[PDB]
Design an enzyme around this catalytic site. Sequence first.
Site, PDB file in Angstrom:
ATOM      1  N   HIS A  50      39.830   6.006  24.810  1.00  0.00           N
ATOM      2  CA  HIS A  50      38.538   6.407  25.428  1.00  0.00           C
ATOM      3  C   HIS A  50      38.103   7.816  25.017  1.00  0.00           C
ATOM      4  O   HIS A  50      36.996   8.244  25.447  1.00  0.00           O
ATOM      5  CB  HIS A  50      38.558   6.212  26.945  1.00  0.00           C
ATOM      6  N   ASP A  55      39.310   0.252  34.981  1.00  0.00           N
ATOM      7  CA  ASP A  55      39.270  -1.122  34.428  1.00  0.00           C
ATOM      8  C   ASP A  55      39.564  -2.119  35.565  1.00  0.00           C
ATOM      9  O   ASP A  55      38.901  -3.152  35.621  1.00  0.00           O
ATOM     10  CB  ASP A  55      40.208  -1.263  33.218  1.00  0.00           C
ATOM     11  N   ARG A 113      48.028   6.905  23.983  1.00  0.00           N
ATOM     12  CA  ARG A 113      47.379   5.603  24.237  1.00  0.00           C
ATOM     13  C   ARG A 113      46.627   5.142  22.994  1.00  0.00           C
ATOM     14  O   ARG A 113      45.581   5.668  22.647  1.00  0.00           O
ATOM     15  CB  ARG A 113      46.427   5.679  25.423  1.00  0.00           C
ATOM     16  N   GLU A 169      45.519  -3.851  34.317  1.00  0.00           N
ATOM     17  CA  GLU A 169      44.175  -3.330  34.672  1.00  0.00           C
ATOM     18  C   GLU A 169      43.108  -4.425  34.562  1.00  0.00           C
ATOM     19  O   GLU A 169      41.920  -4.095  34.449  1.00  0.00           O
ATOM     20  CB  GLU A 169      43.868  -2.075  33.850  1.00  0.00           C
ATOM     21  N   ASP A 184      55.164   6.604  13.562  1.00  0.00           N
ATOM     22  CA  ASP A 184      55.620   7.336  12.347  1.00  0.00           C
ATOM     23  C   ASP A 184      55.134   8.791  12.375  1.00  0.00           C
ATOM     24  O   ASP A 184      55.875   9.644  11.856  1.00  0.00           O
ATOM     25  CB  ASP A 184      55.265   6.577  11.077  1.00  0.00           C
TER      26      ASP A 184
HETATM   27  O1  HBA Z   1      41.156   5.341  30.734  1.00  0.00           O
HETATM   28  C1  HBA Z   1      40.074   5.466  31.188  1.00  0.00           C
HETATM   29  C2  HBA Z   1      39.692   6.484  32.140  1.00  0.00           C
HETATM   30  C3  HBA Z   1      38.676   6.247  33.064  1.00  0.00           C
HETATM   31  C4  HBA Z   1      38.269   7.240  33.931  1.00  0.00           C
HETATM   32  C5  HBA Z   1      38.894   8.482  33.898  1.00  0.00           C
HETATM   33  O2  HBA Z   1      38.514   9.467  34.764  1.00  0.00           O
HETATM   34  C6  HBA Z   1      39.907   8.728  32.977  1.00  0.00           C
HETATM   35  C7  HBA Z   1      40.298   7.733  32.105  1.00  0.00           C
HETATM   36 ZN    ZN Z   2      41.745   1.373  31.483  1.00  0.00          ZN
END
Ligand code: HBA
Ligand code: ZN
Lengths: 253, 253, 253, 253, 253, 253
Positions: free
Chosen positions: F47, F177, F72, F151, F86
């Site tokens: 994200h 999510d 992530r 999620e 790696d």
């Molecule tokens: O991973 C997504 C995410 C959503 C809201 C947030 O504040 C931080 C991360």
């Molecule tokens: Zn998420």
Amino acid sequence: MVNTVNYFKQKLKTEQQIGMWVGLADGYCAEIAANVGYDWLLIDGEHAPNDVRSILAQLQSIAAYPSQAVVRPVSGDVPLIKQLLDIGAQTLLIPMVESAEQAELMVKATRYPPEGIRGVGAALARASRWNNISDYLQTADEQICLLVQVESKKGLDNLDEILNVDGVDGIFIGPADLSAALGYRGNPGHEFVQNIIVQTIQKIRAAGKAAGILSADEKLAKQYLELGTEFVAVGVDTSLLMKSMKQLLSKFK
Amino acid sequence: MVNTVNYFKQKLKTEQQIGMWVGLADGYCAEIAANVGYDWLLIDGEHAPNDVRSILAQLQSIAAYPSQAVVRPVSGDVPLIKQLLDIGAQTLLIPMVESAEQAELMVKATRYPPEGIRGVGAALARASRWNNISDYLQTADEQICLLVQVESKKGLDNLDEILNVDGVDGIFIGPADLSAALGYRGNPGHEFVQNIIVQTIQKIRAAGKAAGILSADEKLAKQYLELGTEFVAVGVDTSLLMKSMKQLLSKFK
Amino acid sequence: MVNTVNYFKQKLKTEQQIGMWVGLADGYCAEIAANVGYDWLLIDGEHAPNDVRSILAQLQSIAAYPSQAVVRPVSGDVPLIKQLLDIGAQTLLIPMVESAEQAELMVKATRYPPEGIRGVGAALARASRWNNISDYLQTADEQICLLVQVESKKGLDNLDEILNVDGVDGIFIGPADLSAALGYRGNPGHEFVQNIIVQTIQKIRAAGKAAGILSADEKLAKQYLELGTEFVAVGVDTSLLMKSMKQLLSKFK
Amino acid sequence: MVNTVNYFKQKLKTEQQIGMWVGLADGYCAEIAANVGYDWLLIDGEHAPNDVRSILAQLQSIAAYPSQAVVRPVSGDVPLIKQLLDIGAQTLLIPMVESAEQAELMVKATRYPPEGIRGVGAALARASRWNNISDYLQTADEQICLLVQVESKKGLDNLDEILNVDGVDGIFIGPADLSAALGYRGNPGHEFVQNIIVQTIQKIRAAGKAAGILSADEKLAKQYLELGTEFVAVGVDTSLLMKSMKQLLSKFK
Amino acid sequence: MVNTVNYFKQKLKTEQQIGMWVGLADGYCAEIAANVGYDWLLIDGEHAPNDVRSILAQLQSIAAYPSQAVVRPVSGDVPLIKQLLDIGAQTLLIPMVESAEQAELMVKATRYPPEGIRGVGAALARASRWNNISDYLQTADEQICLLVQVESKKGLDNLDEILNVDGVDGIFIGPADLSAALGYRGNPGHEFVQNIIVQTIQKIRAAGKAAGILSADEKLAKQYLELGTEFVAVGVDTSLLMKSMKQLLSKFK
Amino acid sequence: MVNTVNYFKQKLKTEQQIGMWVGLADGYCAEIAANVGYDWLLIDGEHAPNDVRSILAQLQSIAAYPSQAVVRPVSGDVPLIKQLLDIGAQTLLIPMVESAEQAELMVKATRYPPEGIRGVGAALARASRWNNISDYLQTADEQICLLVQVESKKGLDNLDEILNVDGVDGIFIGPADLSAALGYRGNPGHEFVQNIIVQTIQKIRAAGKAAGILSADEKLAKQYLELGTEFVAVGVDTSLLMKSMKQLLSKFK
Ligand SMILES: O=Cc1ccc(O)cc1
Ligand SMILES: [Zn+2]
Ligand SMILES: O=Cc1ccc(O)cc1
Ligand SMILES: O=Cc1ccc(O)cc1
Ligand SMILES: O=Cc1ccc(O)cc1
Ligand SMILES: O=Cc1ccc(O)cc1
Ligand SMILES: O=Cc1ccc(O)cc1
Ligand SMILES: [Ca+2]
Ligand SMILES: [Ca+2]
Ligand SMILES: [Zn+2]
Ligand SMILES: [Zn+2]
Ligand SMILES: [Zn+2]
Ligand SMILES: [Zn+2]
Ligand SMILES: [Zn+2]
């Protein structure tokens, strides 16, 4: 802050938008294009050497100007679509769409759960201006525009089925990929290819969707505009740069 | 490996070299320019957003092509000249040179001790291809070309003195800076400015030096070529990109 | 957090430190060098294509490893020294120092007012870890190490004067620049040059300062270490990379 | 296109502008700051790891937002000022100005010949939007704002003389550099320093120039605003990032 | 301009090509390698930190030198293959190929429709030099070379089937991946592994395809060359850099 | 050198680790976060606008500090997992894991053959410090930590099955999510969502796995810590930067 209004999306129903292809893959070159006054700029993540970070830089450059940004990802990849939406691309052009099932998946890829599968990460995203757009998660889906490319025999074989997909805003015709698929590689100007393109534009508009195309040929582009084609790209920054420098040298050889 | 031959430098005495200004400040854009067939490409470190590392990238792009690279540093700074020579720029264009004393210092800045003041760091440098050019420290000075710009009243006031400096290969006239200095800012096309430019070209060539200039005006550039001007830049990549995109849009408004 | 201890500076009085020149100009290459176990790494801002931002990246890579970072700026430029200190370079190697007056200015350039002229901007600086080193403005000056290069006839002409400057911690001899200055360009191995280098090392140590040098010649480097030279660089990453790849290819031609 | 109007410059006579220091040295971080609603954003080229190219990226990010960009170069270097004006910085903050003669040179550095010494390269410059601002060379000088820092004893010793320089729009007080110069390094809050700052603000405004200052101390900033100080920076992005992350961790240790 | 001739591809039938692995992931390091005289340079997109844009920079560096570039993508991903062909990589090494069906898909991925599925975007591509190679869409397929890696039990289980795929120019053996798959992780030198490698080389050549392998072991590499192996990589830039710096330090400890 | 010990992985069984989300996508910003003292830093490749090369830069910055790095990726993509391992990421957080079969594949993706499918390329990898960790191929698997996100409704529908997968070290709950999946998009604070989160935490810990979560809500985060949740992220750098700059401006409006 209210969510950035997608004027490209609105103008699909009210006017014919003139586009420039941006393959120079660079924030500085994208800003030069943004000063010209094109209705839309296509940031090409499929055929120019772009990644999420170079596309972000070009969105930031273009954002100070009225030209609307459209991003083409390298393929209809759901996680890549998620990344391009979060950096704030509001219009996507998906290459090589070949079925209603693929078009439906691209619709879902652009919309939040529970109705879609767009990953939720608003806090982090330029798309929400890091939650400075306070109601982003409620208002996002409305300003997202999904365009799909029909540019293969299988695409044409599934044209009616794709045109029935709710959430496909526009179908764009790719004459390079389509002419090659038809066995006229490098020769989209041939009557065989052009009659298929014209028929395809008529069917797109008859189904109530926006039709789009690219042609660097002024006569073909004006023909497509006369047919009512909603989004027409009329040139390519790399081609204009190369041709202008060659034409100048030829005056001095 | 033998040191890269500076064909630009040799051709100052045998032909008239057609140049393109490179201000897109980018390895990818520089490669596009390098494909056209210009005799020389000016990588502009004075008026485009370049640094040593972006200039290096453009030299690497251009190096696969016959076009000869000329680098303009932001000023006649001795340490910056050292940096640009070591990344392998073999021709430099020094802006705003205004005396024989400054021109002599620029000569020394381009030559190794004991005769010059170029810092010695061959092992590290693309210029020596990291000592893969085995005799670089003996053969370097010969393939270095120094061009100086006369583009102010003080420059014109010291023209005869600069033209007497051994090691100045070429004097380049800057019409934008010169027209502004003369109180005709934005209007180099005026007869007052042009008569000074023509007289200046004649004096440069009469003293046995190469004369150079930039004009995007085809008629002026051809006039300068008819006078025997050795290195003429005939256009600018940023200008060609912007004008080509504007001219295309104007066909569709 | 307490200020990072400059172990390079402390070890100038307690041992002989073995150095590697880092001209690959890259955070990833700098980390490879950092894993080897050199006492010190010279990040070369004079003869490799580095700027403040690429030097920062290399400081960040190296910082996880015991190897101490020394940064060579392109010249004894006061504002550039300010920038390199604020990104957190604790030891600087100033090229081409030629007088007590220039050495004194370099001392002041590395110390805060009122005693020096180092610009004060700790809040913003990796040097203070953004004020996470709470007493940085009181403790900074003590962990800063100033080295100056004697590598010209004027340097040797002012050696006794430079060696009398309080705040010069070390004098480094540059054999490439010095041999060129002496009219033995490319031939520092000549007895004329070597006798001057040995005499210079002896004078530096006799005045209570640390002596330094670079030589990729194992015999010369071991000779310099036998004389008690405090900081000896024994190789260059670009040279080791090129030579190792050439030696390998020669086994297969 | 008409030249971008410098609202910072106009607002120096009509209101008190609240500023944020931008030292995160990055287009993405600069955009986050640009969303907040500060009257002005200081892109710090003196004490953050910035160069022309990183400052360009931040100008491009900020350009889509109402916040006015002010750029601090590393020093009053004429060629660097030329570079920063051409990438389109319309307001400059020159550090460590210490005489009327230096302030006059900074005025000339920001204006085209024949009255100034700003190098002429409009065609290439984001400043002219590559000549899309058709009358740029006639309209540029009017939207350029020059601020100079008084932040040393010699600056205070030449305050009345600097305040008499036509073309200096604003004098900014640097409490870190000034408190260090006064022998109160790290302690600008001391009455000795504060009485000099207040007196200095009063003298600046009495001479008809804009006064400016930075303080992260809310009480000091509000005091400076009560005195009528025209441009007050109230915090620093690096400081706010570090402090917010520390305060959060402290809730959980 | 005629399409760049793929000399690597032609030399698969006429000689044994000596290769160097390029994992330093940087245009400057790639140029150093390009000066050595290796027949081929493997730009590693699987095990070095490379993306399309960093691979482009390295192709640009290498392009001025005779060494032929081979690119390994992270996986047999059709859209990534499209991207790497368009930046102008003419030889690809696909990792972990395990069936005739996967090898056939890799063949199609490298050829234009209607026979292949390579996306058509010549105008934008360094591959066509932005259509400066006028007949690129007719001449491209002939200068593209496809290599596939057999380096798992499933690959060996499908070896005869892969060797029957028209369009596979070469099979490369990956001793690290293969020795790990065989339960001899880190011990490819074991007789069990080596007899399988030799047998595999013999089968590849008996089917009329080029065989390739990497070994930093001089004796193993010379053994593979004695068997007739067409493309042998004999070392790795990261390994040669680390080993040369370690061996040097060991002389001084 | 011995392999870097994964203290994050060990501390999953001995304490509750406090985390900070790093979405500023930048080596310089990552270093600021690294100075604070968080147990763990989440470098967000899903994200925030990160790629392999920007994640490498952030790993290099962070590596000098005690804070443990967790990466992530954009999705559970096997080749991308190979790349991130790696460059030396020792802990991975896989988004949107929805079955035991997907969790098992993620386990294999992180382990070398013959037991897993992690591609073998240690010589080239920062993970082995370019084989400076001499036994890396035997010691790697032990210091790798696999976390998976539950999620979605399908994740919760397969929770018992995922919790039975050997090699899943931790399950992280994604409230953004999950709340969207449950039809409470933007409202994870609702009792319906919170009761599901608490139940999920209880089930994870009851199956002997580490539970994790992110909440910028101090009360919720403290509630999760009271339940014994092993890895709790308590904030996001982009959010803390935006909020701190907004709160400061509000004091001056
Ligand atoms: O991973 C997504 C995410 C959503 C809201 C947030 O504040 C931080 C991360
Ligand atoms: Zn998420
Ligand atoms: O500093 C310059 C220098 C010269 C030759 C070398 O081998 C290394 C460095
Ligand atoms: O200009 C330098 C400076 C010093 C301290 C700060 O807090 C901010 C900026
Ligand atoms: O060198 C500056 C310059 C000015 C105007 C141009 O058109 C090109 C270059
Ligand atoms: O999308 C691919 C493409 C092909 C040819 C062009 O001229 C422009 C774009
Ligand atoms: O392709 C992976 C690889 C493994 C070990 C090496 O030495 C080089 C490359
Ligand atoms: Ca990238
Ligand atoms: Ca730079
Ligand atoms: Zn297409
Ligand atoms: Zn000029
Ligand atoms: Zn030297
Ligand atoms: Zn200051
Ligand atoms: Zn392999």
